[PDB]
Design a protein around this ligand. Structure first.
Ligand SMILES: Nc1ncnc2c1ncn2[C@@H]1O[C@H](COP(=O)(O)OP(=O)(O)O)[C@@H](O)[C@H]1O
Ligand SMILES: [Mg+2]
Ligand SMILES: [Mg+2]
Lengths: 16, 1544
RNA sequence: GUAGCAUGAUCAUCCGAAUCCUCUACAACGAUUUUUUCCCCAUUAUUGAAUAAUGGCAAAAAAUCCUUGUAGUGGAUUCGGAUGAUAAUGCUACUG
């Protein structure tokens, strides 16, 4: 895959 | 702090409940539990004041880690007013002893430390468990299995079960590990092990809300997608790493210690190779887990660690492999940075470029981590935010630190808010990235976190517990949550309000993490409710199950004195004792464990051996436990090891190797045990060997009394008794020239004088003298002449004549001198003899009747000279004259009478026109006036030398023709005439030297008689005497086939025995300070060598069951100066020594003269007043002839005036003056340095050896109570010293030893000797690092006696052969000839290195270096050696196989043959050239002035700045060296080479 | 007899060198021990499925001991160099 994918740049924390 | 620290409502009830009963308090971390603990400690402050024996007690505060212990110690110290003792293993209590342990106990009320330290202190009986008040236990959850807490608690079970101290445990977590299910059994185990009942808050709404100020955190979870794709670069890295692994396994280094499984079932890789492989595996795991850029960060840490390891790599092969690993890691870093920059081309702005690279070249989980950070802190104030991050691996912490630093620098928003830091456990990794010790630092990472310098901390579980950390608000967990305890403690760390607990995990493990967290929450909730609903029991009083809790193991054994040996500490005790034994680097201390075999198991044990496992414990050959020991049959190999070690240590204690306190014994215990046997006599002198404080003022030197020999004691003849007259004779050894014939003819006249005695005098040796004109000899008649003093007035006249001789003729008189009437000490007379009835020599009654007092030379004038009678030639021929006319008041001796010559005759020389008379007028006419009887004759006179001490040869250009070139002719009428037999006068000046030397010779003869009687020799050569010799090589007195040694020959054959003559004894007595022609320093070396040999042999044959170290220490202690002095003082010898230079007029007392008897008594009665009497006071008294003749005691008014003058010194400068240097000889006292006595003991031993031999000399040691010889083995103290010293280990016979020794014949032919027993050679060849041998012991026990044998043999040879060369360099020659490096050169010369049955990594390399260096030098001594270093073991094994050769032969003659055969070239080289001085000769060089700075050793290198001077210049040079002193030695060697080249 | 020069020895004081060490505070080194955890494997009880028992393989945590180096001391022995001063010896002038 050569280049690692970008995880969600916008990501608000989830609460258990 | 102060008293403002106020407990809450629950702490008071907790303390009240804990007072009534023991228990474990359980509260969340940060609830103030330490405060309630110290509050409990307040309630036990009753017995802390009183000491232990008075009935008081102390307290114990327990901790598991050093830093936590220190923190709580300072906390309690600031929170109370108790003397807080702090003891840890690092502090140095390992060598603490009884008294300064007890004073520490009594000087403290509360004690803190690590569990091992307190456990060791308790087991060693420093305190009794019943002597304690309360033992506070912290982090009590650690107490399971073999943890030190449980072991310490067991002592409560094994100690007295009454009046036992309170125990309380502290924790915030109760369980360690994954043992959550069925909490109740674990909790009950904790209950019983600490014999307490857990107490926790239950009154909810009152103080649960209160203590919840340490609020629980909010827990959130964030997932990340898995990564699956594998980059090609990763597989390239893997391929390179695996091929490097293969190469590393293939490549060869020296022999290394062998490691294997924990159960030892399977082998393992070597330690260092395992270490490097482990580092590489950790790096691979890092790069797998975190990606690419993180590996780029961590490869720097790998580089720095590998470089540091190479730098400290002593072995060349280790350096090579570390360099190879460094090259591999450098290639990895090059590829990594190449790939890193491969995508940096896009944007030229470094900030965003590095940021996007971080988000690009990293695993997604770290990316989510970074977004979490960025949106969490969101550019807030830096000081407020204090977050924590936990990771598992150590190198992970440094890697994430590097990544975080790079990101923070790449984020300007976070570039000023986050100041991270990382910290890990004890196996510390250098936080630097560049080089070792770049700069020093003093703030711990924890400290910087506490100061706000580090708002972020990266750490493993090392920061989970204990360490005081202020209330943090954020905690992040990267690696998966593992244990219940760490999870609960971490969530308890988040103490402040609205603290966030955050953790990250992969998507596919979300359900597993949910299960784990819910399981842990259940584990906490059921525990809480179980405590809330538990059964009300008091203190777990069920003693039966309490004992059943521990019975499963091996029951600990306790001996008397209360010392108890914990089985779980058996491994520690045994390994520590093994470490106490000295060894080289590879020389293994670990007892090589082994696992048995079932066939062997039932071959050695019964049928039960098949069910369970048995093992064996071996012992390195250095110790005496050569017999192997087998463990009891145990199921698991673990308890098998425990049992094996326990039994082994029990046997060791039984042998006494372990002290009573169950700790290995040092040399102090050995010397303490030996003191009451071999150093008993020190007590009578107020000193002891164990008193190490005696090492302070050893230079102090004491005084001694003196007494004349027995013959001279109270031997004044009595009137009416028989008396012995002993004639003196004078034979001029020199031939006389024309200017000296007067003395030569005069002293040979038959008219001589004699010494008069009332006791008989033994035969005396002929004595040499050194006149101003030649050499002289003196002999004393053997057969005395017999007279009886019928007239008391004859005796009175004799005494008057003897007194007046010293009073007038020799000018020895003193104002206080008085003829002795008491006649006790050194009383006798000397009387002249005249030719009597032919052969008879009666007394010169004429001289004494006339010359009672010498008349005074008066200045006769012309007027009285007219009627004075003319001078008769007979009246003046050979008579004493003096020149009263001139200023010269000394006496004169005439030689011949010039009858034909007359005044007005010209002086022959230089005044052929000037006559004697006219010259006399021109010279002293104002005084003489004129000469009457002008036609009379003249005479010829010669001077009498004023010198009195003729011992030293006054070497010089006397110029016999020029000294008396002037000729002295006088008119008789102008000089006084002492009509006297001038020959008697010129003999009389030599009297004092003869008197003193015969005074000492009498002591010498008495000693010779004593040592001939005590050793019981009364054979034919006992009688007679020999002429006294003199030495030339004594500085001041300037003017094939081996030859068998004579000492061994006389010790084996009595035909060559020779009787000891007075001269040798006297020389042994004459100190070098009393500078005569000889002294003892030539015999001192032989005495020292023989004493060393005798002490070595006796100790070896007496304490053969001891190791080399204690034997060496004791042997050195034996021949110490203190012990020799103490053993000699009670031998009654020192009061008969010759130490003081003999100056008669001021430092000598005449025989017939003493002080006044009354003042003698006053001096001998007032020691408080003796020390103030001064020589001026003594000279103050003016005693005329009456006082010195008729009374013997001064006048009472004069007595009072003298004592007043003595007392007046107190208020003057005379007070406190060291008058002993001037007045000790007035009462027969003297002060002698202790070194003199230490020398004279060996001096006597040397002659007693030389004349007789070893065997007879052996008795002398026991005579001086040197060694308490055993009567149970009489042959030991006489002959078994050359026949004993072995035990069982040199008795078994087997051919297997030929397996150990390969081509032994080659070594035997190189050495020259043939061994009847090869076992001795193997023992001497048994280096300590050689486990495979089990038939014989090590080589130290052989080297110990080899050293003594070699040094004694070489000293005997150099003394017997190297004659014409002074002892001051003989000591240097022997020291050089016994040097270890010389022995190493000898060993490599015959290539004995090949046969050294040893194995070691660095030792093999260093011996290879030394041997190839010597090959380069061609097996020649480089006089020292410029090589890097020398192997001590090489010279050791050579000089040990010397003793092996002796023991195989048991013949000192063969030993000398072989030693000479290898030492021939080196002996002829050292005895021809200057042997060696080195170093010092540069310092004291005529123009070379070398000074040096502090050398620093760096790994395998050391440099030193050599600041010297050469050829009137100053040059700066360096040299290759090993250590600091070796750097100095190499610099000195280079300076020596430069000086030699400059001279050349 | 009188001076100068040279020399030997000794005390005292200062400094140095060699050997042996001790103590202090700091740092490094190596070894051993104890707890905990994961993975995998083996052997059994049973044969496949499934279990159980242990035993072994890697990771984290904690203690103890030894060694080395840094410097300061301090001590013992040997010994040198420097110097007041003391006394001794020899020589070279002035002589007696
Ligand atoms: N009732 C109280 N009285 C006095 N000090 C308290 C009280 N409650 C809490 N503290 C303080 O709060 C601190 C809590 O931290 P500490 O108890 O040392 O951590 P741990 O609970 O791990 O021992 C204590 O140092 C203590 O001084
Ligand atoms: Mg913080
Ligand atoms: Mg605490």
């Amino acid at each position: 895959i050569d280049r690692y994918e970008q995880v969600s740049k916008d990501f608000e924390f989830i609460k258990i | 702090e102060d008293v403002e620290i106020k407990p809450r409502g629950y702490q008071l009830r907790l303390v009240d409940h804990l007072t009534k009963s023991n228990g474990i308090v359980y509260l969340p971390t940060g609830s103030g539990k330490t405060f309630v603990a110290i509050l409990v400690l307040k309630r036990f402050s009753q017995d802390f004041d009183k000491p232990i024996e008075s009935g008081g007690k102390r307290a114990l505060f327990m901790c598991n880690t050093v830093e936590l212990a220190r923190q709580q110690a300072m906390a309690v110290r600031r929170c109370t007013n108790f003397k807080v003792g702090f003891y840890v293993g690092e502090q140095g209590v390992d060598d603490w002893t009884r008294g300064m342990w007890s004073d520490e106990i009594k000087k403290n009320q509360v004690l803190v430390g690590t569990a091992q330290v307190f456990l060791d202190m308790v087991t060693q009986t420093y305190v009794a468990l019943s002597s304690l008040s309360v033992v506070i236990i912290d982090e009590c959850h650690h107490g399971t299995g073999h943890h030190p807490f449980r072991e310490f608690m067991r002592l409560f079970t094994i100690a007295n079960q009454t009046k036992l101290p309170r125990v309380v445990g502290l924790t915030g977590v109760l369980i360690k590990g994954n043992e959550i299910t069925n909490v109740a059994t674990k909790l009950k185990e904790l209950e019983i092990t600490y014999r307490g009942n857990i107490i926790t808050v239950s009154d909810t709404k009152e103080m649960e809300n209160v203590m919840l100020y340490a609020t629980k955190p909010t827990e959130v979870m964030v997932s990340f997608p898995h990564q699956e794709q594998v980059l090609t670069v990763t597989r390239l890295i893997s391929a390179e790493i695996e091929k490097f692994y293969v190469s590393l396994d293939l490549m060869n280094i020296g022999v290394q210690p062998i490691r294997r499984s924990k159960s030892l079932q399977c082998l393992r890789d070597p330690s260092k190779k395992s270490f490097v492989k482990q580092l590489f595996n950790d790096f691979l795991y890092q790069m797998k887990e975190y990606g690419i850029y993180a590996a780029s960060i961590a490869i720097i840490s790998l580089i720095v660690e590998f470089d540091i390891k190479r730098r400290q790599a002593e072995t060349l092969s280790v350096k090579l492999m570390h360099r190879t690993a460094l090259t591999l890691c450098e290639k990895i870093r090059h590829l990594l940075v190449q790939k890193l920059q491969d995508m940096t081309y896009d944007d030229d702005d470094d900030n965003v470029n590095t940021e996007e690279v971080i988000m690009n070249f990293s695993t997604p989980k770290v990316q989510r981590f970074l977004m979490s950070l960025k949106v969490s802190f969101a550019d807030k104030d830096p000081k407020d935010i204090c977050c924590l991050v936990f990771v598992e691996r150590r190198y992970t912490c440094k890697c994430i630190y590097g990544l975080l630093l790079n990101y923070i620098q790449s984020t300007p928003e976070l570039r000023n808010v986050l100041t991270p830091q990382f910290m890990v456990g004890r196996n510390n990794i250098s936080p630097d990235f560049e080089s070792v010790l770049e700069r020093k630092w003093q703030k711990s990472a924890i400290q910087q976190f506490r100061d706000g310098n580090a708002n972020l901390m990266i750490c493993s579980s090392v920061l989970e517990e204990g360490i005081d950390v202020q209330a943090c608000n954020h905690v992040f967990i990267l690696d998966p949550v593992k244990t219940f305890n760490m999870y609960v403690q971490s969530k308890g760390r988040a103490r402040t309000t609205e603290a966030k607990f955050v953790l990250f995990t992969a998507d596919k493990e979300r359900e597993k993490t949910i299960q784990q967290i819910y399981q842990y929450r259940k584990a906490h909730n059921d525990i809480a409710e179980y405590l809330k609903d538990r059964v009300l029991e008091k203190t777990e009083p069920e003693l039966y199950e309490i004992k059943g809790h521990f019975q499963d193991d091996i029951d600990p054994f306790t001996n008397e004195n209360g010392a108890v040996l914990l089985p779980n500490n058996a491994l520690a005790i045994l390994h520590r004792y093994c470490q106490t034994i000295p060894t080289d680097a590879f020389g293994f201390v670990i007892p090589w464990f082994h696992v048995l075999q079932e066939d062997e198991r039932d071959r050695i044990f019964g049928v039960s051996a098949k069910g369970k496992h048995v093992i064996s414990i071996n012992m390195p050959v250095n110790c005496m436990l050569r017999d192997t020991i087998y463990s009891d049959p145990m199921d698991n190999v673990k308890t098998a090891k425990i049992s094996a070690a326990f039994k082994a240590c029990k046997v060791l204690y039984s042998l006494g190797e372990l002290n009573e306190r169950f700790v290995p014994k040092t040399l102090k215990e050995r010397v303490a045990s030996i003191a009451d046997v071999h150093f008993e006599h020190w007590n009578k002198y107020g000193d002891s060997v164990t008193a190490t404080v005696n090492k302070a003022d050893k230079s102090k030197d004491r005084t001694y009394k003196t007494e004349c020999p027995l013959e001279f004691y109270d031997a004044l003849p009595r009137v009416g008794e028989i008396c012995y007259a002993y004639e003196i004779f004078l034979e001029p050894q020199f031939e006389s020239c024309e200017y000296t014939e007067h003395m030569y003819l005069n002293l040979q006249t038959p008219r001589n004088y004699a010494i008069l005695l009332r006791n008989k005098l033994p035969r005396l040796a002929e004595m040499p003298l050194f006149s101003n004109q030649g050499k002289l000899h003196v002999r004393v008649a053997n057969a005395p002449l017999e007279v009886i003093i019928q007239n008391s007035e004859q005796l009175e006249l004799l005494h008057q004549f003897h007194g007046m001789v010293f009073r007038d003729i020799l000018k020895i008189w003193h104002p206080f001198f008085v003829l002795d009437r008491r006649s006790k000490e050194n009383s006798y007379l000397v009387v002249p003899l005249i030719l009597g009835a032919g052969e008879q020599k009666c007394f010169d009654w004429e001289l004494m009747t006339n010359f009672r007092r010498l008349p005074q030379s008066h200045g006769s004038n012309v007027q009285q000279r007219e009627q004075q009678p003319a001078p008769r030639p007979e009246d003046f021929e050979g008579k004493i004259v003096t020149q009263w006319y001139a200023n010269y008041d000394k006496p004169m001796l005439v030689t011949k009478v010039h009858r034909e010559l007359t005044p007005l005759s010209y002086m022959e020389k230089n005044q052929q026109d000037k006559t004697y008379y006219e010259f006399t007028m021109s010279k002293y006419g104002n005084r003489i006036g004129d000469v009457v009887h002008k036609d009379k004759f003249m005479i010829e006179v010669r001077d009498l030398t004023e010198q009195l001490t003729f011992y030293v040869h006054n070497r010089g250009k006397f110029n016999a023709k020029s000294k008396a070139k002037m000729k002295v002719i006088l008119i008789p009428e102008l000089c006084f005439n002492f009509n006297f037999p001038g020959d008697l006068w010129l003999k009389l000046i030599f009297l004092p030297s003869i008197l003193n030397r015969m005074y000492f010779l009498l002591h010498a003869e008495a000693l010779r008689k004593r040592f001939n009687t005590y050793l019981n020799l009364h054979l034919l050569p006992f009688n007679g005497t020999d002429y006294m010799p003199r030495p030339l090589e004594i500085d001041y007195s300037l003017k094939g086939k081996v030859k068998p040694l004579l000492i061994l020959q006389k010790t084996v054959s009595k035909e060559h025995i020779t009787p000891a003559e007075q001269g040798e004894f006297l020389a042994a007595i004459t100190a070098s300070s009393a500078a005569d022609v000889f002294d003892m320093e030539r015999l001192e070396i032989l005495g020292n060598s023989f004493l060393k040999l005798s002490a070595t042999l006796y100790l070896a044959s007496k304490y053969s069951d001891w190791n080399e170290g204690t034997l060496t220490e004791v042997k050195s202690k034996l021949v110490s100066n203190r012990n020799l002095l103490f053993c000699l003082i009670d031998a009654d010898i020192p009061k008969t020594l010759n130490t003081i230079q003999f100056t008669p007029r001021y430092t000598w007392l005449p025989p017939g003269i003493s002080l006044p008897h009354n003042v003698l008594a006053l001096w001998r009665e007032n020691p408080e007043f003796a020390k103030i009497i001064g020589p001026h006071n003594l000279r103050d008294l003016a005693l005329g002839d009456e006082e010195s003749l008729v009374k013997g005691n001064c006048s009472d008014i004069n007595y009072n005036r003298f004592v007043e003058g003595c007392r007046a010194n107190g208020q003057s400068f005379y007070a406190g003056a060291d008058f002993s240097s001037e007045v000790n000889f007035c009462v027969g006292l003297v002060t002698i340095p202790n070194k003199v006595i230490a020398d004279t003991l060996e001096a006597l031993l040397g002659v007693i050896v030389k004349n007789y031999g070893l065997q007879h000399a052996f008795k002398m040691l026991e005579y001086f109570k040197i060694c308490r010889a055993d009567i149970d083995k009489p042959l030991t103290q006489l002959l078994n010293l050359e026949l004993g010293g072995k035990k069982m280990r040199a008795n078994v016979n087997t051919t297997e030893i030929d397996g150990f020794l390969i081509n032994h014949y080659y070594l035997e032919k190189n050495l020259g000797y043939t061994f009847k027993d090869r076992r001795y050679l193997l023992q001497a060849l048994t280096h300590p690092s050689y486990p495979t041998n089990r038939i014989t012991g090590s080589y130290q026990e052989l080297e110990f006696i080899g050293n003594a044998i070699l040094d004694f043999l070489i000293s005997a040879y150099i003394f017997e052969n190297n004659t014409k060369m002074n002892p001051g360099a003989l000591t240097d020659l022997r020291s050089a000839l016994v040097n270890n490096t010389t022995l190493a050169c000898i060993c490599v010369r015959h290539r004995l290195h090949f046969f050294i049955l040893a194995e070691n990594a660095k030792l093999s390399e260093i011996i290879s270096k030394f041997v190839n260096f010597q090959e380069s030098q061609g097996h020649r001594v480089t006089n020292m050696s410029t090589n890097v270093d020398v192997p001590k073991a090489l010279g050791d094994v050579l000089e040990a196989l010397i003793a092996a050769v002796y023991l195989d032969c048991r013949d000192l003659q063969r030993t000398w043959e072989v030693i000479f055969n290898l030492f021939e070239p080196e002996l002829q080289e050292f005895t021809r050239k200057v042997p060696i001085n080195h170093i010092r000769q540069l310092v004291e060089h005529k123009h070379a002035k070398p000074v040096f700075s502090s050398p620093i050793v760096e790994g395998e290198t050391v440099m030193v700045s050599c600041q010297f001077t050469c050829m009137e210049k100053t040059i700066k040079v360096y040299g290759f060296g090993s250590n600091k002193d070796q750097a100095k030695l190499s610099a000195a060697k280079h300076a020596l080479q430069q000086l030699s080249k400059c001279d050349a």
